[PDB]
Amino acid sequence: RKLCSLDNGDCDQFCHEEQNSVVCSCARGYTLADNGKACIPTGPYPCGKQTL
Amino acid sequence: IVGGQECKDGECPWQALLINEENEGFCGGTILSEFYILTAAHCLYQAKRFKVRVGDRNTEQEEGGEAVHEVEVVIKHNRFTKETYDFDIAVLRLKTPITFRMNVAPACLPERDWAESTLMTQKTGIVSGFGRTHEKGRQSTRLKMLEVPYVDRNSCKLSSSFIITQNMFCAGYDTKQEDACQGDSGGPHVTRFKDTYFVTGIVSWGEGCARKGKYGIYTKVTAFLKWIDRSMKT
Ligand SMILES: O=C1[C@@H](NS(=O)(=O)c2ccc3cc(Cl)ccc3c2)CCN1c1ccc2c(c1F)CCNC2
Ligand SMILES: [Ca+2]
Numbered sequence A: 001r002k003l004c005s006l007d008n009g010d011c012d013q014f015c016h017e018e019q020n021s022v023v024c025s026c027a028r029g030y031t032l033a034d035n036g037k038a039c040i041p042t043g044p045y046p047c048g049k050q051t052l
Numbered sequence B: 001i002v003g004g005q006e007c008k009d010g011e012c013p014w015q016a017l018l019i020n021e022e023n024e025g026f027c028g029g030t031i032l033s034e035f036y037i038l039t040a041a042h043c044l045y046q047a048k049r050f051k052v053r054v055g056d057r058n059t060e061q062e063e064g065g066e067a068v069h070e071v072e073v074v075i076k077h078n079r080f081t082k083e084t085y086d087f088d089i090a091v092l093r094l095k096t097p098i099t100f101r102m103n104v105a106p107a108c109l110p111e112r113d114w115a116e117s118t119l120m121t122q123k124t125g126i127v128s129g130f131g132r133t134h135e136k137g138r139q140s141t142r143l144k145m146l147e148v149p150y151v152d153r154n155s156c157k158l159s160s161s162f163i164i165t166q167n168m169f170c171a172g173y174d175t176k177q178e179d180a181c182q183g184d185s186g187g188p189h190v191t192r193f194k195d196t197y198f199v200t201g202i203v204s205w206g207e208g209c210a211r212k213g214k215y216g217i218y219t220k221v222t223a224f225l226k227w228i229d230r231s232m233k234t
């Protein structure tokens, strides 16, 4: 298990392997956090979250 | 939904219900955005004129979250085949935008490769709807959800008296009495990942409901990600 194969590459959401390194990204309505892994909602009612 | 549980408050906010002229649900849908609903192409032959209802968990009481939306455009997959239900997918553009609130929120569209490698390899997905609670029963007045295991593609092909195209996948159980059913068609099959729910399928068809040696057959949403994106730009 390597990169995206190992625990989703530590990404909250999408994991891609560009070169031989993990690249994380997020669904629309989320921005990648400063650590380059977590996905932060841009606004209220982001997709995929149960309400409250 | 045969078996499973009630969707509790806020639990299935992406659920949409296609309602006929008599305000009766005949199919489900998934909220993709303020303007778009994902559903099954086969649902578009079950009613002449229909609307979409969101924010509803109990069709017998007003809960304060219900909203009815008229449909501006029906975008059906042109390769949809009634005999096989291949390409069983459609997108609906609503006339007015859905206002997200408690019990009303979209499910996320995943990326194809990641979904196939990471979501579809999870043990289970979640199917939801107002469909029948047993094969010969009536439709549920309560929105239900059900955890459905992903089923091995070969086992599913072996179990099916009908072709399973590249655009379908199977989920549910061999013998356990849990499955989607009549009226759940067009509805969400979502997969949970780190408390985030991604749409992975569309309730398509089954040889009855919850029958032994039979599984639920769902449109493989990941095969249609580019198509959905195109349909959502017009
Ligand atoms: O979908 C259903 C059944 N209708 S249902 O309302 O009971 C129904 C509809 C959708 C379902 C979806 C899932 Cl995931 C599970 C059970 C379902 C059950 C009756 C027979 N049937 C069916 C069987 C085989 C085939 C098709 C069917 F519709 C279409 C494509 N060709 C094969
Ligand atoms: Ca209600």
Ligand SMILES: [Mg+2]
Pocket (backbone or CB within 6 Å): B172, B173, B174, B175, B176, B210, B211, B212, B213, B214, B215
């Ligand atoms: Mg079965």
